[PDB]
From a paper:
To elucidate the structural features of GalDH and how it interacts with its substrate, we determined the crystal structures of the viridiplantae ancestor without (1.9 Å resolution) and with L-galactono-1,4-lactone (2.1 Å resolution). As a member of the vanillyl-alcohol oxidase family, the structure of vGalDH can be divided into flavin- (residues 1-189, 452-511) and substrate-binding (190-451) domains. For all three substrates, we observed only marginal oxidase activities (< 0.2 s−1).
GULO, ALO, and GalDH are generally named aldonolactone oxidoreductases and form a group of sequence-related flavoenzymes belonging to the vanillyl-alcohol oxidase family. They oxidize the C2 carbon atom of their monosaccharide substrates and thereby generate the characteristic, redox-reactive C2-C3 double bond of L-ascorbic acid and its analogs.
Numbering used by the authors: 9 to 238, 248 to 268, 286 to 506
Write the structure that this text describes.
Amino acid sequence: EHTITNWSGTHAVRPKRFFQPESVEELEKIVKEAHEKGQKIRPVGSGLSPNGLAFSEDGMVSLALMDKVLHVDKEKKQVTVQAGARVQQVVDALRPHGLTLQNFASISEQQIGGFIQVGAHGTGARIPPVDEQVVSMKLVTPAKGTIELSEEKDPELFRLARCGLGALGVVTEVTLQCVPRHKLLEHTFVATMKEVKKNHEKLLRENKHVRYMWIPYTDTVVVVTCNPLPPQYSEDEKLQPLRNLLREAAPEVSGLSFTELRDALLAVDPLDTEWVKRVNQAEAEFWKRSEGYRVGWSDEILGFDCGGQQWVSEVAFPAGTLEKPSAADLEYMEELMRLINKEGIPAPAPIEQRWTAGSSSPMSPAYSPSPDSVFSWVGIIMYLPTEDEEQRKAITEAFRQYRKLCETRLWDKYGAAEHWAKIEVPEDPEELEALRERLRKRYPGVDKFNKARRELDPKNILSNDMIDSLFP
Ligand SMILES: Cc1cc2nc3c(=O)[nH]c(=O)nc-3n(C[C@H](O)[C@H](O)[C@H](O)COP(=O)(O)OP(=O)(O)OC[C@H]3O[C@@H](n4cnc5c(N)ncnc54)[C@H](O)[C@@H]3O)c2cc1C
């Protein structure tokens, strides 16, 4: 009944103790007493991380009841919000103030604490991950009680703690640098690899938001651009290629959304590469029939409800600077498509490619000493289309092998770092040792992160098995 499960049902936990304080004073008392008794209190937001980063069998603390907007600074365009607020609640609260977030990370149901603590991101070559939106914060620490951090109050600890994986304190309050509320024009169109390469450098720098959806085993890339705003196909015709392909396989089809159609297609034979080729070809035809323009407020256009169950792996890797472009982002995709074909991986769509500016947070996968660094983020996916336990098991193993080939063939070469909400802990002790050392190479600040953990959480009450495994 009080099992906590993630979005895709890949991780679940029943914590022995579950705390949901209604005030800072109540939280301060929970942290002091947990510290005195040496009892685990892993901070949890919405609990939606694909890897169950927030999960603990021992103890979890939720700030969901502490979700108020405390202050809007009209002149500085800043909001101070309790960390238990969902992104959606902040968006709704900012609407009458004419403000919005600089960027979004797909789902509006995540909490502000969970959003910043993993270094979540959207797309936009000139826009950093969301940990860089943080101007100041308050943190309840086991060692020092409630502390305030900002560029003016212990900047070094601030830049660690704001992207701190819940390991440095319970965030109570965050001040975010907002931008004016604004409409975006979203353009969806298809291109080949060749057309993408031709326009790529200029497209990234001349469009506020650019995202590619690569369709494996096709030469279709779906390009989506969004910019501030100063033959039409029916839904039935857009879905026709997927509906026709599903009728061809041994079986109301007409009731299914696009995402339910892709799931029902993949469910036929999810690990058969020749079948996945046909599913991906049908999906490419859907996207060709989906070219066009939408207009909406930035939160509506940049936000997605998603909905499927899936395995995801996303890596950040450097792709030069605004002034000195790098080809590493297109070269990565070239090698990844070659790897999928060469190895016969039943890779469904999309392989999602996004861009951020660098972050000054040392634990950001997109950490850079340069503010105008550009990072490419590449997400691979396999869907879990049914609750069939044997099929889920087979796809889980296929995804592990798919990710492992990217890790061994590409990640070190490109300096790729895994998203903190998507990274899985290996069980093999040699692979775990190897990952711990890889994290020290990918993250210059790992030793300083552990130093801050010893300083703020000496009895290690904020860390779960995952944190202990990655950062011994
Ligand atoms: C369908 C889906 C789509 C996604 N799309 C994107 C995307 O586009 N871009 C992207 O970057 N990410 C994306 N994510 C990942 C998501 O942004 C992260 O998993 C995020 O951490 C979820 O927020 P949450 O409130 O569920 O956090 P949780 O999973 O509950 O917690 C995440 C981390 O925050 C810590 N934490 C939470 N609250 C506090 C607090 N008050 N104080 C201290 N630590 C705290 C936890 O200990 C944990 O380390 C997606 C996830 C899903 C399921």
